[PDB]
Design a protein around this ligand. Structure first.
Ligand SMILES: [Zn+2]
Ligand SMILES: [Zn+2]
Ligand SMILES: [Zn+2]
Length: 572
């Protein structure tokens, strides 16, 4: 009932009753809120409402204090002070940007821009408000009731009329009735049940609207520089493998937090797990937003770190299969590998946060509020894909606005930059180096002479809003008959529905760009599918073509990105 003002920390009894989060506002800051917004309900121990029976005046600007009681202009006694006077709202202990965060619906890019250019307290208010807004939107979607069960991987769905039907991909996980979480792909629909329950007729599926806890810890703790390595103990016997990262590993020990920008295949995994071998006594908690990123870090630890001193932290709600080779849920092991949402409350010599472009400011705050650590290391790449913003429909979110780390990396530069790509044929390294890395990314590999492009707009059909280009898949089919080395290729495209079609016609394994991130395949076939903003996004384009170790075929729709591709062009 009494806390600190989210804009200046000044003590107060005043909360805004109109803000979805109900932030504490001091008398000065609460005034400049209610005088500039549709927000006029103020809360104290008792709410600021006229006390006259049956009176419905709740607007703080139309109210007064009558002794220790509140009344409107129509009910106030002769001796009454206005609640809104000389730049203040009356409360105990007696912002433009706060107003925009408080009142925005989060459908505009400028909203996320402001959520990342504002003060640090207003970054937490923004992340709360947004995450709340994201959840109360999941209510807006219709329920899906099973009409009939066909097979162990297909059924027919009946959708609640009046309420819209959510996009039917992987980024939308339903809660089934709790028969465990479930996902669907396209009148027969393919069902993927986290728990193998023999789907019954009438059983209904609904989207998981989780309760948005409030944020306490900053996105980033304040930066500390040291004179010498602090609370860590280096080796002077350090494997030649990791000799390239010794100067970076010493920067990590001589700062509170550090930023590593690592373009595809520049040895992020290698750097993170090498940090443990360089400070071999140090307790490290390895965290990322996804189970895939954390399981990636587990595979690298398995190779180089002692398996006994490693534990994979899995929450009791088993959502996806993940890493098996460690001891599970031993929080006290020197090496702990855990998704941000499952982190325990503990401390660490070093916390390593990986896949930092996929992290929200909400994730940056949670991490700092569960883990107290001597050193924090932020590993990722602002030139890769951000967390999907399900509410954002107007404007494109630039990398400098993904989170506070990406903002740092794009403005003051990262602390450390892995600058040599060991994965990709030079054709791919040269293209993305120019596209997103201002020509600072170097090829270790030679040109493969197995990187082809083809400009072929084909024909764009849609399943709802997800795009399909059958002619582009026809061009791929033709290529495969003449290029049998590509039989093993991973088919990639920016659209599930295109991948679904390509799966049936080609029989190739299938990946969206967004699900391909952090993976690598010998051969990649990418069809752009459309000329949309989604399919032309340079971060997405970067990830798509940097999945390939040996070869890539890009069938393109965008003249620009086709011409940028430093690949051999094909005819037809
Ligand atoms: Zn408000
Ligand atoms: Zn204040
Ligand atoms: Zn009244």
């Amino acid at each position: 009932a009494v806390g600190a003002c989210v804009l200046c920390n000044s003590q107060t009894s005043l909360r805004c009753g109109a803000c979805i989060r109900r932030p504490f506002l001091c008398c000065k800051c609460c005034y400049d809120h209610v005088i500039s917004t549709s927000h006029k309900l103020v809360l104290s121990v008792n709410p600021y409402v006229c006390n006259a029976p049956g009176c419905d005046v709740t607007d703080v600007t139309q109210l007064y204090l009558g002794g220790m009681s509140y009344y409107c202009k129509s009910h106030k006694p002769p001796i009454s002070f206005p609640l809104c006077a000389n730049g203040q709202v009356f409360g105990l202990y007696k912002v433009t940007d706060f107003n925009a965060i408080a009142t925005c619906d989060w459908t505009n890019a400028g909203d996320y821009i402001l959520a990342n250019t504002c003060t640090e307290r207003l970054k937490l208010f923004a992340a709360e408000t947004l995450k709340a807004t994201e959840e109360t939107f999941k209510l807006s979607y219709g329920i899906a009731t099973v009409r009939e069960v066909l097979s162990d991987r297909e059924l027919h769905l009946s959708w609640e009329v009046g309420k819209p039907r959510p996009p039917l991909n992987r980024n939308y996980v339903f809660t089934g009735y709790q028969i465990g979480e479930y996902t669907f792909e396209k009148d027969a629909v393919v069902y993927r049940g986290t728990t193998t329950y023999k789907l019954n007729v009438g059983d209904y599926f609904v989207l998981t609207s989780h309760t948005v806890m409030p944020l306490s810890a900053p996105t980033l703790v304040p930066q500390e520089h040291y004179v010498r390595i602090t609370g860590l103990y280096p080796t002077l016997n350090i494997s030649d493998e990791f000799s390239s990262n010794v100067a970076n590993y010493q920067k990590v020990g001589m700062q509170k937090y550090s930023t590593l920008q690592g373009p595809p295949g520049t040895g992020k995994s290698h750097f993170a797990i090498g940090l443990a071998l360089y400070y071999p006594s140090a307790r490290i908690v390895y965290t990322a937003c996804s189970h895939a990123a954390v399981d990636a870090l587990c595979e690298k630890a398995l190779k180089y770190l002692p398996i006994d001193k490693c534990s994979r932290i899995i929450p009791a709600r088993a959502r996806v299969e993940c890493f098996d080779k460690f001891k599970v849920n031993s929080t006290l092991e020197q090496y702990v590998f855990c998704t941000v949402n499952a982190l325990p409350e503990t401390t660490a010599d070093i916390v390593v946060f990986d896949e930092i472009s996929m992290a929200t400011n909400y994730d940056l705050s949670v991490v700092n509020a569960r883990l107290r650590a001597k050193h924090y290391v932020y590993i990722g790449d602002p030139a890769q894909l951000p967390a999907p913003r399900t509410l954002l429909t107007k404007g494109t979110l630039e990398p400098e606005y993904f989170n506070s780390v990406c903002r740092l990396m794009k403005t003051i530069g990262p602390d450390m930059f892995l600058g040599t790509c060991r994965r990709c044929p030079a054709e791919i390294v040269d293209t993305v180096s120019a596209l997103v890395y201002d020509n600072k990314l170097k090829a270790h590999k030679d040109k493969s002479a197995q990187c082809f492009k083809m400009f072929y707009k084909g024909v764009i059909t849609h399943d709802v809003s997800s795009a399909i280009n059958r002619p582009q898949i026809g061009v791929v089919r033709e290529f495969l008959t003449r290029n049998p080395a590509w039989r093993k290729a991973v088919f990639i495209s920016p659209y599930n529905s295109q991948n679904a079609v390509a799966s049936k016609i080609l029989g190739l394994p299938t990946q969206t760009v967004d699900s391909s991130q952090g993976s690598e395949y010998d051969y990649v076939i990418f069809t752009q599918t459309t000329e949309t903003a989604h399919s032309c996004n340079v971060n997405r384009f970067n990830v798509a073509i940097t999945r390939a170790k040996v070869g890539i075929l890009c069938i393109m729709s965008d003249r620009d990105l086709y011409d940028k591709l430093q690949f051999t062009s094909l005819e037809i």
